[PDB]
Design a protein around this ligand. Structure first.
Ligand SMILES: Nc1nnc(Cc2ccc(Cl)cc2)o1
Ligand SMILES: [Cl-]
Length: 402
Protein backbone atom coordinates (compact mmCIF):
# COMPACT_ATOMS: atom_id res chain seq x y z
CA UNK A 1 0.00 0.00 0.00
CA UNK A 2 1.04 3.51 1.05
CA UNK A 3 4.62 4.78 1.45
CA UNK A 4 5.47 6.40 4.77
CA UNK A 5 5.05 10.18 4.48
CA UNK A 6 8.42 11.55 5.57
CA UNK A 7 8.47 15.14 6.89
CA UNK A 8 9.30 18.34 5.02
CA UNK A 9 11.56 20.98 6.48
CA UNK A 10 15.19 22.00 6.77
CA UNK A 11 17.73 19.22 6.24
CA UNK A 12 18.51 17.15 9.32
CA UNK A 13 21.83 17.70 11.07
CA UNK A 14 24.55 15.69 12.77
CA UNK A 15 23.73 14.56 16.30
CA UNK A 16 26.27 11.84 17.03
CA UNK A 17 28.46 12.17 20.12
CA UNK A 18 31.65 12.41 18.01
CA UNK A 19 32.44 12.86 14.34
CA UNK A 20 32.12 9.83 12.06
CA UNK A 21 33.28 10.02 8.42
CA UNK A 22 34.62 13.56 8.95
CA UNK A 23 37.00 12.73 11.79
CA UNK A 24 40.70 13.37 11.34
CA UNK A 25 43.43 11.67 13.35
CA UNK A 26 46.82 12.89 14.47
CA UNK A 27 48.80 9.70 14.94
CA UNK A 28 52.03 8.16 16.25
CA UNK A 29 53.53 4.70 15.71
CA UNK A 30 53.87 4.05 19.48
CA UNK A 31 49.53 4.06 28.11
CA UNK A 32 48.61 7.34 29.83
CA UNK A 33 46.04 9.14 27.59
CA UNK A 34 47.33 12.66 28.16
CA UNK A 35 50.89 11.60 27.27
CA UNK A 36 49.61 9.89 24.11
CA UNK A 37 47.69 13.06 23.23
CA UNK A 38 50.70 15.32 23.59
CA UNK A 39 52.98 13.14 21.47
CA UNK A 40 50.28 13.14 18.80
CA UNK A 41 49.93 16.93 19.07
CA UNK A 42 53.66 17.48 18.62
CA UNK A 43 53.70 15.54 15.32
CA UNK A 44 51.77 18.39 13.65
CA UNK A 45 53.49 21.67 12.83
CA UNK A 46 50.86 23.44 10.74
CA UNK A 47 49.04 25.07 13.67
CA UNK A 48 48.12 28.72 13.19
CA UNK A 49 46.09 31.48 14.86
CA UNK A 50 42.58 29.98 15.03
CA UNK A 51 39.39 31.67 13.90
CA UNK A 52 35.71 30.90 13.39
CA UNK A 53 34.75 29.82 9.87
CA UNK A 54 31.22 28.44 10.50
CA UNK A 55 29.59 30.03 13.54
CA UNK A 56 27.15 28.28 15.83
CA UNK A 57 23.92 30.21 15.25
CA UNK A 58 22.57 29.62 18.78
CA UNK A 59 25.90 29.66 20.68
CA UNK A 60 28.37 32.20 22.08
CA UNK A 61 30.99 31.80 19.38
CA UNK A 62 33.82 33.81 21.08
CA UNK A 63 33.65 31.31 23.93
CA UNK A 64 34.25 28.31 21.70
CA UNK A 65 37.34 30.02 20.28
CA UNK A 66 38.59 31.03 23.73
CA UNK A 67 38.11 27.41 24.79
CA UNK A 68 40.27 25.93 22.05
CA UNK A 69 43.00 28.51 22.69
CA UNK A 70 42.82 27.54 26.37
CA UNK A 71 43.31 23.86 25.52
CA UNK A 72 46.46 24.68 23.54
CA UNK A 73 47.66 27.01 26.26
CA UNK A 74 47.21 24.46 29.07
CA UNK A 75 48.81 21.73 26.99
CA UNK A 76 51.72 24.13 26.53
CA UNK A 77 51.86 24.32 30.36
CA UNK A 78 51.82 20.52 30.74
CA UNK A 79 54.82 20.32 28.42
CA UNK A 80 56.97 22.53 30.70
CA UNK A 81 56.29 20.54 33.88
CA UNK A 82 59.10 18.00 34.25
CA UNK A 83 56.62 15.22 35.10
CA UNK A 84 53.76 15.11 32.59
CA UNK A 85 50.76 14.59 34.92
CA UNK A 86 48.32 11.74 34.52
CA UNK A 87 45.35 14.08 34.09
CA UNK A 88 44.81 17.80 33.46
CA UNK A 89 42.03 19.75 35.15
CA UNK A 90 41.23 22.89 33.17
CA UNK A 91 41.12 26.30 34.77
CA UNK A 92 37.44 27.07 35.35
CA UNK A 93 37.37 30.02 32.98
CA UNK A 94 34.29 32.02 32.01
CA UNK A 95 34.28 30.51 28.51
CA UNK A 96 34.31 26.97 29.89
CA UNK A 97 31.73 27.74 32.55
CA UNK A 98 29.44 28.97 29.79
CA UNK A 99 30.18 26.11 27.43
CA UNK A 100 29.69 23.52 30.19
CA UNK A 101 26.39 25.06 31.32
CA UNK A 102 27.60 25.81 34.87
CA UNK A 103 11.05 20.65 15.13
CA UNK A 104 10.61 18.86 11.79
CA UNK A 105 13.60 18.02 9.58
CA UNK A 106 13.86 16.49 6.11
CA UNK A 107 16.23 13.68 5.15
CA UNK A 108 19.63 14.89 3.97
CA UNK A 109 21.97 12.84 1.76
CA UNK A 110 24.84 12.92 4.31
CA UNK A 111 23.43 10.20 6.59
CA UNK A 112 23.35 7.62 3.78
CA UNK A 113 26.94 8.67 3.03
CA UNK A 114 27.88 8.17 6.69
CA UNK A 115 26.39 4.68 6.54
CA UNK A 116 28.21 3.85 3.30
CA UNK A 117 31.47 5.00 4.86
CA UNK A 118 30.81 2.83 7.93
CA UNK A 119 30.67 -0.26 5.68
CA UNK A 120 34.09 0.45 4.16
CA UNK A 121 37.36 -1.36 4.82
CA UNK A 122 40.28 0.53 6.38
CA UNK A 123 44.01 -0.09 6.01
CA UNK A 124 44.41 -0.73 9.76
CA UNK A 125 42.78 -3.31 12.03
CA UNK A 126 40.84 -2.18 15.08
CA UNK A 127 40.39 -5.40 17.13
CA UNK A 128 42.34 -8.49 18.15
CA UNK A 129 41.63 -11.93 16.74
CA UNK A 130 39.93 -12.96 20.01
CA UNK A 131 38.07 -9.67 20.55
CA UNK A 132 34.60 -11.11 19.90
CA UNK A 133 32.82 -13.07 22.60
CA UNK A 134 33.18 -13.50 26.34
CA UNK A 135 33.00 -17.25 26.86
CA UNK A 136 34.18 -18.80 30.12
CA UNK A 137 35.12 -22.08 28.48
CA UNK A 138 37.03 -22.91 25.29
CA UNK A 139 34.73 -22.50 22.30
CA UNK A 140 33.87 -25.55 20.19
CA UNK A 141 35.27 -25.99 16.70
CA UNK A 142 32.34 -24.80 14.58
CA UNK A 143 31.93 -21.69 16.75
CA UNK A 144 35.65 -20.94 16.48
CA UNK A 145 35.66 -21.20 12.67
CA UNK A 146 32.60 -18.95 12.44
CA UNK A 147 34.16 -16.33 14.73
CA UNK A 148 37.47 -16.33 12.84
CA UNK A 149 35.73 -15.99 9.46
CA UNK A 150 33.51 -13.14 10.67
CA UNK A 151 36.41 -11.47 12.49
CA UNK A 152 38.50 -11.50 9.31
CA UNK A 153 35.71 -9.59 7.54
CA UNK A 154 35.07 -6.85 10.14
CA UNK A 155 38.46 -6.33 11.88
CA UNK A 156 39.36 -3.71 9.22
CA UNK A 157 35.84 -2.31 8.93
CA UNK A 158 35.30 1.41 9.54
CA UNK A 159 32.35 0.76 11.84
CA UNK A 160 34.74 -1.22 14.04
CA UNK A 161 36.83 1.92 14.40
CA UNK A 162 33.63 3.64 15.49
CA UNK A 163 33.07 0.90 18.07
CA UNK A 164 36.56 1.18 19.56
CA UNK A 165 36.55 4.98 19.33
CA UNK A 166 33.22 4.91 21.16
CA UNK A 167 34.44 2.41 23.75
CA UNK A 168 37.52 4.50 24.60
CA UNK A 169 35.86 7.87 24.94
CA UNK A 170 32.88 6.58 26.96
CA UNK A 171 35.21 4.68 29.31
CA UNK A 172 37.43 7.73 29.80
CA UNK A 173 34.43 10.02 30.36
CA UNK A 174 32.59 7.63 32.70
CA UNK A 175 35.79 7.11 34.69
CA UNK A 176 36.50 10.85 34.93
CA UNK A 177 32.91 11.50 35.99
CA UNK A 178 33.46 9.72 39.30
CA UNK A 179 37.24 10.12 39.68
CA UNK A 180 37.20 13.92 39.15
CA UNK A 181 33.65 14.97 39.93
CA UNK A 182 34.21 18.73 40.39
CA UNK A 183 36.97 19.22 37.79
CA UNK A 184 36.72 20.41 34.18
CA UNK A 185 38.95 17.59 33.10
CA UNK A 186 40.61 17.63 29.68
CA UNK A 187 39.96 14.23 28.16
CA UNK A 188 41.75 13.13 24.97
CA UNK A 189 39.75 11.27 22.32
CA UNK A 190 42.04 8.35 21.51
CA UNK A 191 41.95 5.10 19.58
CA UNK A 192 44.50 2.41 18.88
CA UNK A 193 44.99 0.32 15.77
CA UNK A 194 47.49 -1.94 14.01
CA UNK A 195 48.69 -0.86 10.59
CA UNK A 196 48.69 -2.90 7.39
CA UNK A 197 52.29 -3.79 8.24
CA UNK A 198 51.38 -4.79 11.83
CA UNK A 199 52.73 -1.67 13.55
CA UNK A 200 50.84 -0.51 16.63
CA UNK A 201 49.57 3.09 16.18
CA UNK A 202 47.93 5.58 18.58
CA UNK A 203 45.31 8.03 17.23
CA UNK A 204 44.15 11.38 18.58
CA UNK A 205 40.80 12.65 17.24
CA UNK A 206 40.54 15.69 19.47
CA UNK A 207 39.53 16.40 23.03
CA UNK A 208 36.54 16.68 25.24
CA UNK A 209 36.30 18.77 28.40
CA UNK A 210 33.81 17.51 30.96
CA UNK A 211 31.73 19.58 33.36
CA UNK A 212 30.71 18.94 36.94
CA UNK A 213 29.62 15.33 37.16
CA UNK A 214 27.82 14.37 40.37
CA UNK A 215 25.93 11.49 38.79
CA UNK A 216 23.68 10.19 41.56
CA UNK A 217 21.76 7.93 39.15
CA UNK A 218 21.68 6.58 35.61
CA UNK A 219 19.78 9.44 33.93
CA UNK A 220 21.80 12.26 35.50
CA UNK A 221 23.60 14.24 32.81
CA UNK A 222 27.22 15.37 32.59
CA UNK A 223 27.87 18.16 30.10
CA UNK A 224 30.94 18.27 27.91
CA UNK A 225 32.52 20.22 25.08
CA UNK A 226 33.98 18.28 22.17
CA UNK A 227 36.76 19.63 19.96
CA UNK A 228 37.44 17.39 16.98
CA UNK A 229 39.96 17.63 14.15
CA UNK A 230 38.69 17.46 10.60
CA UNK A 231 39.50 18.21 6.98
CA UNK A 232 35.81 18.65 6.14
CA UNK A 233 35.13 22.25 5.19
CA UNK A 234 31.82 22.87 7.04
CA UNK A 235 30.72 25.47 4.48
CA UNK A 236 29.99 22.75 1.89
CA UNK A 237 27.12 21.28 3.94
CA UNK A 238 26.26 23.77 6.67
CA UNK A 239 22.93 22.19 7.61
CA UNK A 240 24.85 19.11 8.75
CA UNK A 241 26.64 21.35 11.24
CA UNK A 242 23.80 23.31 12.87
CA UNK A 243 25.00 22.26 16.34
CA UNK A 244 28.67 23.18 15.87
CA UNK A 245 30.98 26.11 15.94
CA UNK A 246 33.71 25.22 13.44
CA UNK A 247 37.21 26.71 13.71
CA UNK A 248 40.07 26.76 11.24
CA UNK A 249 43.09 25.92 13.34
CA UNK A 250 45.86 24.89 11.00
CA UNK A 251 47.02 23.58 7.64
CA UNK A 252 48.17 20.06 6.87
CA UNK A 253 50.51 18.90 4.11
CA UNK A 254 49.07 15.81 2.42
CA UNK A 255 49.97 13.17 -0.12
CA UNK A 256 47.29 13.06 -2.81
CA UNK A 257 46.55 11.85 -6.33
CA UNK A 258 48.25 15.11 -7.48
CA UNK A 259 51.24 14.91 -5.18
CA UNK A 260 51.68 17.10 -2.14
CA UNK A 261 48.93 19.58 -1.24
CA UNK A 262 48.19 21.80 1.74
CA UNK A 263 44.67 21.53 3.12
CA UNK A 264 43.07 23.59 5.90
CA UNK A 265 42.53 21.76 9.15
CA UNK A 266 39.30 22.48 10.97
CA UNK A 267 38.11 21.94 14.52
CA UNK A 268 34.44 21.04 15.08
CA UNK A 269 33.30 22.33 18.47
CA UNK A 270 29.99 21.68 20.17
CA UNK A 271 28.48 21.35 23.61
CA UNK A 272 26.77 18.09 24.36
CA UNK A 273 25.90 15.79 27.20
CA UNK A 274 25.51 12.17 28.14
CA UNK A 275 24.34 10.17 31.15
CA UNK A 276 25.59 7.27 33.22
CA UNK A 277 23.38 4.77 31.43
CA UNK A 278 24.37 6.03 27.97
CA UNK A 279 28.04 5.89 28.95
CA UNK A 280 27.66 2.28 30.09
CA UNK A 281 26.13 1.42 26.70
CA UNK A 282 28.97 3.30 25.02
CA UNK A 283 31.36 1.03 26.92
CA UNK A 284 29.57 -2.05 25.52
CA UNK A 285 29.74 -1.15 21.78
CA UNK A 286 31.88 -4.25 21.16
CA UNK A 287 28.54 -6.05 21.60
CA UNK A 288 27.76 -4.79 18.10
CA UNK A 289 30.39 -7.25 16.85
CA UNK A 290 28.79 -10.03 18.84
CA UNK A 291 25.20 -9.29 17.87
CA UNK A 292 25.92 -9.06 14.15
CA UNK A 293 28.05 -12.22 14.29
CA UNK A 294 24.97 -13.97 15.69
CA UNK A 295 22.76 -12.71 12.89
CA UNK A 296 25.31 -14.28 10.54
CA UNK A 297 25.33 -17.50 12.58
CA UNK A 298 21.53 -17.52 12.48
CA UNK A 299 21.83 -17.62 8.68
CA UNK A 300 24.48 -20.36 8.62
CA UNK A 301 22.47 -22.47 11.06
CA UNK A 302 19.39 -22.10 8.84
CA UNK A 303 21.33 -23.27 5.77
CA UNK A 304 22.95 -26.07 7.77
CA UNK A 305 19.52 -27.29 8.94
CA UNK A 306 18.42 -27.64 5.31
CA UNK A 307 21.61 -29.31 4.01
CA UNK A 308 22.15 -31.71 6.98
CA UNK A 309 25.85 -30.71 7.13
CA UNK A 310 27.83 -27.79 8.50
CA UNK A 311 27.74 -24.95 5.96
CA UNK A 312 30.25 -22.53 7.55
CA UNK A 313 33.00 -22.95 4.95
CA UNK A 314 30.43 -22.91 2.13
CA UNK A 315 28.74 -19.80 3.53
CA UNK A 316 31.87 -17.71 4.08
CA UNK A 317 33.72 -18.85 0.97
CA UNK A 318 30.50 -18.28 -1.06
CA UNK A 319 30.66 -21.75 -2.63
CA UNK A 320 21.06 -23.25 -3.08
CA UNK A 321 22.12 -19.58 -3.47
CA UNK A 322 24.03 -18.59 -6.61
CA UNK A 323 25.20 -15.20 -5.34
CA UNK A 324 25.14 -12.53 -2.66
CA UNK A 325 22.87 -9.51 -3.11
CA UNK A 326 25.21 -7.06 -1.37
CA UNK A 327 28.07 -8.40 -3.51
CA UNK A 328 30.17 -10.52 -1.12
CA UNK A 329 29.82 -12.32 2.18
CA UNK A 330 32.24 -9.74 3.53
CA UNK A 331 29.88 -6.93 2.58
CA UNK A 332 26.94 -8.62 4.29
CA UNK A 333 29.01 -8.91 7.49
CA UNK A 334 29.98 -5.24 7.33
CA UNK A 335 26.47 -4.02 6.50
CA UNK A 336 25.06 -5.92 9.49
CA UNK A 337 27.79 -4.51 11.73
CA UNK A 338 27.34 -0.95 10.48
CA UNK A 339 23.58 -1.15 11.08
CA UNK A 340 24.17 -2.41 14.61
CA UNK A 341 26.80 0.27 15.25
CA UNK A 342 24.62 3.07 13.89
CA UNK A 343 21.77 1.78 16.10
CA UNK A 344 24.15 2.37 18.99
CA UNK A 345 25.55 5.70 17.75
CA UNK A 346 22.04 7.03 16.97
CA UNK A 347 20.02 5.29 19.69
CA UNK A 348 16.77 7.11 20.48
CA UNK A 349 13.11 6.52 21.38
CA UNK A 350 12.23 7.36 17.78
CA UNK A 351 14.46 4.54 16.58
CA UNK A 352 12.80 2.21 19.09
CA UNK A 353 9.27 2.96 17.93
CA UNK A 354 10.19 2.89 14.25
CA UNK A 355 11.86 -0.53 14.55
CA UNK A 356 9.13 -2.32 16.51
CA UNK A 357 6.26 -0.77 14.56
CA UNK A 358 7.74 -0.95 11.05
CA UNK A 359 8.46 -4.63 11.84
CA UNK A 360 4.72 -5.26 12.28
CA UNK A 361 3.92 -3.52 8.98
CA UNK A 362 6.60 -5.47 7.09
CA UNK A 363 5.14 -8.88 8.00
CA UNK A 364 1.69 -7.61 6.98
CA UNK A 365 2.89 -6.35 3.59
CA UNK A 366 4.88 -9.57 3.05
CA UNK A 367 1.95 -11.85 3.84
CA UNK A 368 -0.18 -9.61 1.60
CA UNK A 369 2.27 -9.69 -1.32
CA UNK A 370 2.67 -13.47 -1.14
CA UNK A 371 -1.05 -14.32 -1.14
CA UNK A 372 -2.75 -11.54 -3.15
CA UNK A 373 -4.09 2.55 9.16
CA UNK A 374 -3.24 2.62 12.85
CA UNK A 375 0.25 1.23 12.30
CA UNK A 376 1.02 4.17 10.01
CA UNK A 377 0.35 6.79 12.69
CA UNK A 378 2.43 4.85 15.23
CA UNK A 379 5.24 4.68 12.67
CA UNK A 380 5.04 8.24 11.38
CA UNK A 381 4.78 9.63 14.94
CA UNK A 382 8.45 8.55 15.10
CA UNK A 383 9.51 10.35 11.89
CA UNK A 384 10.45 13.76 13.31
CA UNK A 385 14.08 14.80 12.81
CA UNK A 386 16.48 11.95 13.61
CA UNK A 387 18.76 11.36 10.58
CA UNK A 388 19.23 7.63 11.26
CA UNK A 389 15.48 7.01 11.64
CA UNK A 390 14.66 9.05 8.53
CA UNK A 391 17.21 7.03 6.55
CA UNK A 392 15.75 3.74 7.84
CA UNK A 393 12.30 5.05 6.94
CA UNK A 394 13.61 5.83 3.44
CA UNK A 395 15.06 2.30 3.24
CA UNK A 396 11.72 0.87 4.33
CA UNK A 397 9.99 2.70 1.45
CA UNK A 398 12.37 1.05 -1.02
CA UNK A 399 11.25 -2.32 0.37
CA UNK A 400 7.71 -1.04 -0.30
CA UNK A 401 8.37 -0.52 -4.03
CA UNK A 402 9.56 -4.13 -4.60
N1 LIG B 1 51.00 20.92 23.04
C1 LIG B 1 50.86 22.09 22.20
N2 LIG B 1 50.25 23.23 22.51
N3 LIG B 1 50.35 24.07 21.43
C2 LIG B 1 51.02 23.42 20.48
C3 LIG B 1 51.43 23.89 19.08
C4 LIG B 1 50.98 25.25 18.55
C5 LIG B 1 51.86 25.93 17.72
C6 LIG B 1 51.52 27.16 17.17
C7 LIG B 1 50.29 27.72 17.45
CL1 LIG B 1 49.85 29.32 16.75
C8 LIG B 1 49.39 27.05 18.28
C9 LIG B 1 49.73 25.81 18.82
O1 LIG B 1 51.33 22.20 20.95
CL1 LIG C 1 31.92 -8.72 23.36
Amino acid sequence: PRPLRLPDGPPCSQRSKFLLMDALKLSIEDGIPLYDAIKCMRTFFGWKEPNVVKPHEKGINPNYLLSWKQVLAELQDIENEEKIPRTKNMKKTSQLKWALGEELRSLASWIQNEFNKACELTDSSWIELDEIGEDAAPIEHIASMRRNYFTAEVSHCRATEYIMKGVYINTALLNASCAAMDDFQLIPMISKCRTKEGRRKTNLYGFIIKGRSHLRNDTDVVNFVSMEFSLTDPRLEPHKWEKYCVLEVGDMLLRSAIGHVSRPMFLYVRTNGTSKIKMKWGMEMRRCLLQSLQQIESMIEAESSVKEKDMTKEFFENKSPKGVEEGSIGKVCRTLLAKSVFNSLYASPQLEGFSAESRKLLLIVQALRDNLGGLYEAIEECLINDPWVLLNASWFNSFLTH
